[PDB]
Enzyme design. Structure first.
Site, PDB file in Angstrom:
ATOM      1  CG  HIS A 126      -0.444   0.303   2.506  1.00 33.99           C
ATOM      2  ND1 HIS A 126      -0.077  -0.676   3.404  1.00 33.99           N
ATOM      3  CD2 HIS A 126      -0.213   1.486   3.126  1.00 33.99           C
ATOM      4  CE1 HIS A 126       0.351  -0.112   4.519  1.00 33.99           C
ATOM      5  NE2 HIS A 126       0.277   1.200   4.377  1.00 33.99           N
ATOM      6  CG  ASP A 183       0.061  -3.880   2.719  1.00 33.48           C
ATOM      7  OD1 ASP A 183       0.537  -3.428   1.655  1.00 33.48           O
ATOM      8  OD2 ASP A 183      -0.197  -3.165   3.710  1.00 33.48           O
ATOM      9  N   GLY A 209       2.566   6.709   9.098  1.00 33.76           N
ATOM     10  CA  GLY A 209       3.917   7.167   8.840  1.00 33.76           C
ATOM     11  C   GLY A 209       4.850   6.001   9.065  1.00 33.76           C
ATOM     12  CB  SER A 229       2.373   1.653   6.429  1.00 32.23           C
ATOM     13  OG  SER A 229       1.269   2.078   7.217  1.00 32.23           O
ATOM     14  N   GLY A 230       5.052   0.183   6.043  1.00 32.60           N
ATOM     15  CA  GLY A 230       6.086  -0.388   5.208  1.00 32.60           C
ATOM     16  C   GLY A 230       7.263  -0.780   6.082  1.00 32.60           C
TER      17      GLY A 230
HETATM   18  C1  LIG Z   1       0.836   3.791   7.505  1.00 33.42           C
HETATM   19  O1  LIG Z   1       1.922   4.467   8.264  1.00 33.42           O
HETATM   20  C2  LIG Z   1      -0.324   3.523   8.479  1.00 33.42           C
HETATM   21  C3  LIG Z   1       0.147   2.575   9.642  1.00 33.42           C
HETATM   22  C4  LIG Z   1      -1.043   2.343  10.578  1.00 33.42           C
HETATM   23  C5  LIG Z   1      -0.732   1.431  11.725  1.00 33.42           C
HETATM   24  N1  LIG Z   1      -1.958   1.298  12.540  1.00 33.42           N
HETATM   25  C6  LIG Z   1      -1.953   0.524  13.813  1.00 33.42           C
HETATM   26  N2  LIG Z   1      -0.626   0.018  13.988  1.00 33.42           N
HETATM   27  N3  LIG Z   1      -3.091   0.800  14.731  1.00 33.42           N
HETATM   28  N4  LIG Z   1      -1.487   2.812   7.819  1.00 33.42           N
HETATM   29  C7  LIG Z   1      -2.668   3.483   7.147  1.00 33.42           C
HETATM   30  O2  LIG Z   1      -3.122   4.389   7.797  1.00 33.42           O
HETATM   31  C8  LIG Z   1      -3.626   2.390   6.641  1.00 33.42           C
HETATM   32  C9  LIG Z   1      -3.509   2.260   5.141  1.00 33.42           C
HETATM   33  C10 LIG Z   1      -4.852   2.404   4.621  1.00 33.42           C
HETATM   34  O3  LIG Z   1      -5.253   1.188   4.000  1.00 33.42           O
HETATM   35  C11 LIG Z   1      -5.750   2.671   5.821  1.00 33.42           C
HETATM   36  N5  LIG Z   1      -4.985   2.669   7.041  1.00 33.42           N
HETATM   37  C12 LIG Z   1      -5.354   1.814   8.114  1.00 33.42           C
HETATM   38  C13 LIG Z   1      -6.806   1.329   8.310  1.00 33.42           C
HETATM   39  O4  LIG Z   1      -4.531   1.448   8.989  1.00 33.42           O
HETATM   40  C14 LIG Z   1       0.274   4.690   6.375  1.00 33.42           C
HETATM   41  N6  LIG Z   1      -0.318   4.230   5.227  1.00 33.42           N
HETATM   42  C15 LIG Z   1      -0.736   5.241   4.384  1.00 33.42           C
HETATM   43  C16 LIG Z   1      -0.466   6.561   4.868  1.00 33.42           C
HETATM   44  C17 LIG Z   1      -0.842   7.699   4.105  1.00 33.42           C
HETATM   45  C18 LIG Z   1      -1.495   7.532   2.842  1.00 33.42           C
HETATM   46  C19 LIG Z   1      -1.776   6.216   2.335  1.00 33.42           C
HETATM   47  C20 LIG Z   1      -1.388   5.056   3.120  1.00 33.42           C
HETATM   48  S1  LIG Z   1       0.321   6.410   6.408  1.00 33.42           S
END
Ligand SMILES: *[C@](=O)([C]([C][C][C][N]C([N])=[N])[N]C(=O)[C]1[C][C]([O])[C]N1C([C])=O)C1=NC2=C([C]=[C][C]=[C]2)S1
Ligand SMILES: [Ca+2]
Length: 223
Positions: free
Chosen positions: A40, A84, A175, A177-178
């Protein structure tokens, strides 16, 4: 990372920052030419930043290298985030040193209860917004699949696992993610998603890397 602590400059040598004019996701170095991140987080024009601590200050140990190619998992589903995971190849090999090192892939999946290290430059508040410039760390155990699916009924697949604390207060966040989830010296997870951040009974959900080792090894070998 909410409820974590400042890791310390380059204490997590395999942690990378994906940059497209700004930090947008984390990632993990698996060898001098490849990085593992979340599907993602895919986007064109990615620059991998290794050896980073303060992402807003060139401190002397970073290496900025453009990606030459990205490969999203063939079964990635953008709606459910199943599978993912993605691979990113560096245009040029990274120079491996003590502050820029790769993390080993799992040989087998980890069991519930195993302690892991989750890290990233994500939001540090669960009810607000505050992004750190230095890398944040968090020790968190792998939760039973039961507690995971109970918290997210109908949303968890065998390609995901939960880690953290059901009491809340400690978790990954936007922030992050990944980014990596390392347990016993191996990359077992990738920061994927969750309900809000650090909320009770809503632990973080992570991509289960152990299910993709075969795909990773074969894909990088053919690219
Ligand atoms: C990622 O940094 C975050 C990590 C969230 C971790 N949550 C937890 N550990 N309680 N993920 C996003 O916010 C995701 C991706 C989407 O499918 C929806 N959302 C959810 C439901 O967690 C990031 N991913 C993205 C960011 C900005 C724009 C697009 C994706 S920050
Ligand atoms: Ca820096």
């Amino acid at each position: 990372i909410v409820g974590g602590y400042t890791c310390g400059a380059n204490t997590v040598p395999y942690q990378v920052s994906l940059n497209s004019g700004y930090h947008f996701c984390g990632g993990s170095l698996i060898n001098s030419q490849w990085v593992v991140s979340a599907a993602h987080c895919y986007k064109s024009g990615i620059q991998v930043r290794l050896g980073e601590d303060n992402i807003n200050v060139v401190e002397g140990n970073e290496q900025f290298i453009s990606a030459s190619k990205s490969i999203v998992h063939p079964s990635y589903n953008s709606n459910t985030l199943n599978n993912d995971i993605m691979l990113i190849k560096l245009k040029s090999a990274a120079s491996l040193n003590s502050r820029v090192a790769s993390i080993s892939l799992p040989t087998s999946c980890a069991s519930a209860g195993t302690q892991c290290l989750i890290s990233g430059w994500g939001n540090t508040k669960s009810s607000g917004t505050s992004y750190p410039d230095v890398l944040k760390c968090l020790k968190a155990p792998i939760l039973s699949d039961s507690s995971c699916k109970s918290a997210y009924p109908g949303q968890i697949t065998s390609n995901m696992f939960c880690a953290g604390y059901l009491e809340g207060g400690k978790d990954s966040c936007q922030g992050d993610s990944g980014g990596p989830v390392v347990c016993s010296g191996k990359l077992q997870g990738i920061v994927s998603w969750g309900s809000g951040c650090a909320q009770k009974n809503k632990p973080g959900v992570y991509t289960k890397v152990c299910n993709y080792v075969s795909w990773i090894k074969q894909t990088i070998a053919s690219n």
